[PDB]
Symmetry: none
């Protein structure tokens, strides 16, 4: 039963990983272990670079604290200018796969609030309403009339990050 360390204890993030591995590798036995490690970047990364660095650092820090797992997974949401997205990092001992999720364009009122040093999730509640966000399953669910969800967007980025492991012949280590 092979071990995957996820460098988050957030249920949504650990479940996204559960779904991605259970989908791509359906004949394998998997143990999923969420852990909390520091990112060494801002709690709310504000560039593409900082967001990806935060995910790399969490994976590195997870590897250091808990060596010996088959896979280590980082997933960090970030902002740059009027867009939000998340970096997915998957490392084995030998290989690293990466994908950034499809980006969402933020409303100009949201950007105005971010400029006032406000936290994105708070600003989303202000602009869309707390109950509205909750009942529609999140901002992406709300804005796309349920055609997408944060989770279905993250799912595709996790699968893309697994490409080097799906195709070891095309991605030597």
């Amino acid at each position: 039963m092979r071990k995957i360390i996820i460098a988050s204890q957030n249920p949504a993030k650990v479940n996204a990983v559960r779904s991605a591995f259970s989908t791509v590798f359906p004949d394998q036995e998997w143990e999923f272990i969420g852990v909390s490690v520091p990112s060494e970047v801002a709690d709310q990364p504000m560039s593409d670079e900082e967001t990806k660095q935060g995910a790399l650092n969490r994976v590195r820090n997870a590897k250091q604290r808990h060596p010996g797992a088959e896979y280590y997974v980082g997933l960090e949401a970030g902002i740059e200018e009027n867009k939000t997205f998340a970096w997915m990092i998957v490392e084995s001992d030998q290989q690293r796969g990466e994908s950034r999720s499809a980006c969402l364009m933020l409303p100009p009122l949201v950007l105005e609030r971010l400029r006032q040093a406000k936290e994105l999730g708070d600003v989303m509640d202000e602009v869309f309403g707390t109950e509205n966000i909750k009942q529609k399953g999140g901002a992406i669910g709300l804005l796309t009339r349920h055609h997408l969800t944060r989770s279905t967007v993250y799912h595709q980025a996790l699968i893309l990050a697994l490409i080097p492991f799906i195709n070891p012949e095309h991605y030597p280590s």
Copy 2:
């Protein structure tokens, strides 16, 4: 060796799958992790009899097999929050599978979308062996199974089963609409 100790991990309830087949455990893990993304469970397979044919030959027998697996899993392995049975079957020229999900008080169910089988496969009828004979062992493996092969990879057994597992979770998604 250096994993976080179990006693330091997040406490979570269990989900029992009435199967040891990793593809079935994984299909269940994928469905729950999708539908209830803020809740977490440990997914555990167990071995229990269906008490019907190894290859169910009617819709009714296929459903009974999955119900029996869930019943037997509850009797032999008490304590989990949900029990899931997943059983493939045939009736006339169609194949499909029944998904049964039970909590302590409530049952959700869905039969997956059905596939017409080639006449030679029905005639030759273990279904797996026959699929290998008719399409080729390596062909079947490489395309992700018969469904994968037959649909030019647009569907696979797994993406078919995923929809039926979600549908079987309906009573638990909407407890106010499905009194138990």
Copy 3:
């Protein structure tokens, strides 16, 4: 000078579903998709699997008669048996037929009771305040994504002529 596909329904959602399935499976081919209205010769709301399938079959047959010359004809009909709803998909060319029933799901008791008292759409609208599938799954599935699978499965004999005929 362009090939036709006749959908035995003027429902936009059903025409869209058929377009999407054919566009997925045959991305290179072009077709004029045409919704037509024809009798099912069964109840407006089929109350068994057999009746639901018969209705779709009848609609394809009637469409063939009324509108000859098309490359494919497609029937798509929803129905109920016990506490479940599902739909039968029937695709016919001039020589071949494929078919698939969509994944079934349990309807709320309140819905089934009020159904037994008379439309399905009117009932869900009142009970709930993507279709029924979209509402009941909280959008993890929709009617269009569930129908898409059954339509692709119904196309199997056409995709695989060596194995079907």
Copy 4:
């Protein structure tokens, strides 16, 4: 009677992606979808995120100048940065712009070396017919758990968000 949607591309696969995004989000509406050829005013193979987005912006601007009057204009431009590939989707009405970049894909070194036109290399490395029938490089590399179509579909839907939510995305 019917409105036009101009796609700044005559790649059938791009036109078909756009038609599909519009059918999903606006299921009750009908458009004529029309593929056009216009300049990007950037490299034939954009080699940065910035350049890729600019090429898509430019194509939409040129499409509007050459083909005025349509309800929507769409640019869909693939590009590369470091070892990744992705596509910028830009949708404009007369009054508003939606945009999204698709989820990025790490390229095999064999492919990246042979750049030093991505499509040409993918055909050269994976085979022309395999790319066409099996869901593109995305389809081949994910063993069909994803396809180019299913990845594009997501970014096109995200790009339609302002037109879905005019109250939250004012044009001025």
